[PDB]
Design a protein around this nucleic acid. Structure first.
Lengths: 62, 120, 56, 122
RNA sequence: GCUCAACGGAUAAAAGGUACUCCGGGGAUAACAGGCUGAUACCGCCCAAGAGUUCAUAUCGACGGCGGUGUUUGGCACCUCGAUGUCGGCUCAUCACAUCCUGGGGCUGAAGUAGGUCCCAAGGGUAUGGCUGUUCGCCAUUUAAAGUGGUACGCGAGCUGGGUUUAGAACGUCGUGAGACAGUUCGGUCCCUAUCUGCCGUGGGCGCUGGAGAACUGAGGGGGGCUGCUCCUAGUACGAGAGGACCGGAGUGGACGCAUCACUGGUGUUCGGGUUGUCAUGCCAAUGGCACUGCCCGGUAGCUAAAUGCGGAAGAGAUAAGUGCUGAAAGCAUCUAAGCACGAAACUUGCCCCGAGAUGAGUUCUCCCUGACCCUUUAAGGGUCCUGAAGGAACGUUGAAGACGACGACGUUGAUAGGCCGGGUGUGUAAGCGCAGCGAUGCGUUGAGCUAACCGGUACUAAUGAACCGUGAGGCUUAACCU
RNA sequence: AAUUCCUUGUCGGGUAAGUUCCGACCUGCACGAAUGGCGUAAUGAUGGCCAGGCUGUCUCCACCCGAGACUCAGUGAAAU
RNA sequence: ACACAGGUGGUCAGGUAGAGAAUACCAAGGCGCUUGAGAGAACUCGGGUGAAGGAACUAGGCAAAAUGGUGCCGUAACUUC
RNA sequence: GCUCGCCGGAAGACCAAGGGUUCCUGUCCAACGUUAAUCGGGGCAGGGUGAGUCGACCCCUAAGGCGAGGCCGAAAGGCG
RNA sequence: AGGACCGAACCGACUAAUGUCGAAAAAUUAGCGGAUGACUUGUGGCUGGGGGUGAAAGGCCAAUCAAACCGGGAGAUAGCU
């Protein structure tokens, strides 16, 4: 899922920033990543947390 | 959208409008002829004539209604003793409307409304 | 909202094309008085169709 | 004339007291619900010892409306208050047995014969 | 020799903040939008072992390859910093199909019913709420379906200003401090009468080659185009049981559109009545004024909906995907190459409305106009006087017509409007008087009195006779018909 | 938490559904004792959230009374 | 800047109802606000009413609506009593 | 002049402040009045303001100002 | 008795609409806060520009305030328009 978010200002500006939202149906987990400022890399870092979060679910069931 | 409606507003609220024709009706029967705007005169007929219709049948209750409306004893003095008597045969249409011209002030259609009789 | 450009005198004149006043052509003399009065209107002296109804 | 967010009184001994219309069934984006209509409602008020408690979502059929219904002769039947009979969301069968009020002739659709037979009037 | 941190060294003595800001400049240089590109994103194809019961072609399809779209994030600064001045919501939309449904089909490992994948198709429809400032998303409940995008991430000279972006303030963190921030949290002016284009309506002028009053043909254009459930056919076909068709017909709803007040209601400050405080008519009584109509209760005509009827087609022609027939090129096969037939809410029609300014200005029907002179660039000429018709317009009484025009009815050869009479309808037992009662008050007279826009009649009033505009037989050329 | 980035954190309650609200755990990015700490009756044109009453805010708009708007007569601007 | 819906100190300030100088109607007295007349469209502003439901609107019950007086009855948690 | 409507602890009647003849009368209508105007706080001309008791002035002081001499300060000038 | 309560005058200015070349260079309309006090107001004084005053906003100091107005340096300077 790809959605936008607003930004800051100082006079009248309008800065919209994109955010990535990965959703895993088998687990219902939702991981977002606004760390970077590049759609691709944000998705990757999101997938970094996505895989890591899924990895933690393994350790609990373990 | 005013479909099949009746009664002209005449740029005045109900209270003012009613009090207007009440005052005008009294002044009408006093001089038997007055100069006013055409639109105003055309609506004055729907007030004075019903009163003249009530003057033809004298009684005690009608005199009270004749006072209920117009709110003046001088008018009821003229009515039931002058108009009602001399208008017994007249089957409606006691008022005549004559278009004089235009007011020199605001250029409004002036009209002379008088009683049909006005023997003098 | 305002004009982007100044309207020429041509457009000004064309707009006033339908602003010209009309005539009367409804004159009529009284039967008794003969004064030229308006149709359906009483004369200056208070006449109408041969009757000085105003006596003024 | 029963739309969404409408409080209705119960006309059965199911233990409920007051319900609220959360969604009028029928067509897509349907505004009202007549007497002979089904509506999904929730129980906002019930009695202690009942077969149903506050917070249950189930279907119910209207029986009395203040708007009332019309007849083929043009006559209407204005009621006083809104009433409905609870049903079983899956089977649509009535829950209670007793009916605390009169109904209309329109419920004679065979799908609710129990309601008519258990009705004191009409 | 010091010293040139930046090493042609501004003398060899010199750190930060500003969202309270201010001045001079820039699209030479950034944020939103647009533009070029298309790495990334999205979509569609190519080969392909294997997973898969046998078999990849039932899909998927690793490992790799080739292109399209300009819907994402970005790249480059081409446009605007003597202003392109907003995220989201509300309202209103409009277009493209890579289709969410409905419709037409291919295959099945679809038995049936019901699904999966792919092809054709844009006509029409494509939810209601809780949380959040929301786009998004989560959840609940539906629905036939709750599609994906473009349109300055549609729309702010249409609205809101919640978010974020002015000045105030607080908390955490950082800083010696001013203040700052991958931060969050209270309170915070949205300016403008529309000249032009456009669009929704409505008129004036002229033209249509004679003028005028009506009726139509009809190019062309627009509106309309959704769909569920129940029963029947038949609980048949198929099927092991459970289940349970296609096709065609009838009935009944949801949303939407049009029209209409007869029905149920709303309103009805022009109708009737109740009543509080107060003022006035000398007092009581009876009424009127004022206090949002003083507050209220009912209510006619209209307008109007929640109310009542109606519509969505059926059908026809030509096609899409597709099924075909015959059949050669290729002695066979094969839907095609000639030829021929079916085949979608899609195309043109059929349904409704506009419509001859369609200057290509149409057709039909009816009515009216056929007088002397001059000058004569000897012209489809102009001027004088005599004539001025058909019809229209003006003015007037007005309309369920209407912003102003326009349109419709009538103008005494009269029911156009008002008044009047009768009745209807609505409101609820008037006033005055008599009787009873201590009185308030009640009873009888009386379902009376009073009744705006309603209906049927009546010329009492006002719609005056006439004047005004408009004319005198309508060019040339050619051909066909009578002398 | 007026403080918690990850995060709408995980459980209780409240609603059919609750990123806010009210209790609790403590994993305190980056609470902390006069930069006062934790509570606190009363008070507040205070911030946030429910319940009842109540209504045209809304489903969904309709009618009516007035001042403009439109026409007529007089006068007569402005930004651009 | 104007014959401008603004601002400007002190005194007197009545009758009925009313606690009151609130407020409603009036007295003495003073004005009808210096452009009017028709029409009764959309739409804008100032108000009234509304079937059924009752916040489903929305950032938020903003605005509107509603409650409202005197006498008596009665009144919880909590509390610095 | 006859009715109607509005304010009435004010849109009323008097003083101080502050303007400065705007007050009254006759007369005129171009300019001024957001329209017309024989009307007016408009133009023109004439007229009106009378106090031992009202107020100011006057006598006496408050905050505070000025301030002979005096102290201080480049001068100006400051305090008193 | 009360920086006590309800609530006019008076002072103030939280909400909404109208207004935005307005009637008005911050007002009007309908509701609100205080209303015996840290209250409000009239008259006359004192403190003044990098100073005055401030229940502290960087708010006010004659509609002009992160630095008033007037005159003079001064035709300042301007690699920019």
């Amino acid at each position: 899922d790809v959605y936008r978010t607003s930004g800051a200002g100082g006079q009248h500006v309008n800065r919209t920033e994109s955010a990535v939202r990965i959703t895993h149906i088998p687990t219902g987990i939702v991981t977002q990543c606004q760390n970077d400022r590049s759609q691709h890399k944000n998705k990757d870092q999101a997938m970094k947390q996505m895989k890591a979060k899924l990895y933690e679910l393994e350790m609990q069931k373990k | 959208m005013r479909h099949r409606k009746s009664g002209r507003q005449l740029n005045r609220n109900s209270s003012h409008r009613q009090a207007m024709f009440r005052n005008m009706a009294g002044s009408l029967v006093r001089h038997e002829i007055i100069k006013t705007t055409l639109p105003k005169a055309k609506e004055l007929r729907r007030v004075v004539e019903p009163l003249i219709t009530l003057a033809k049948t004298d009684s005690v209750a009608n005199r009270r209604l004749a006072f209920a409306r117009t709110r003046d004893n001088e008018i009821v003095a003229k009515l039931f003793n002058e108009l009602g008597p001399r208008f017994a045969s007249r089957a409606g249409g006691y008022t005549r409307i004559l278009k004089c011209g235009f007011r020199a002030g605001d250029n409004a259609p002036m009209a002379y409304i008088e009683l049909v009789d006005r023997s003098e | 909202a305002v004009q982007q450009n100044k309207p020429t005198r041509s457009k000004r004149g064309m707009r006033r094309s339908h602003d010209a006043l009309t005539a009367v052509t409804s004159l009529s003399v009284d039967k008794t008085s003969g004064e030229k009065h308006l149709r359906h209107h009483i004369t200056a002296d208070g006449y109408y169709r041969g009757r000085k109804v105003i006596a003024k | 004339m029963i739309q969404e967010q409408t409080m209705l009184n119960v006309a059965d001994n199911s233990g409920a007291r007051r319900v609220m219309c959360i969604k009028v069934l029928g067509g897509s984006h349907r505004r009202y619900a007549g007497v002979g209509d089904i509506i999904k409602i929730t129980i906002k008020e019930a009695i202690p010892r009942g077969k149903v408690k506050k917070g249950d979502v189930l279907k119910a059929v209207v029986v009395r409306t203040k708007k009332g219904v019309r007849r083929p002769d043009g006559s209407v039947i204005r009621f006083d208050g809104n009433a409905c009979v609870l049903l079983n969301n899956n089977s649509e069968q009535p829950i209670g047995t007793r009916i605390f009020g009169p109904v209309t002739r329109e419920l004679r659709s065979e799908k609710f014969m129990k309601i008519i037979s258990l009705a004191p009037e009409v």
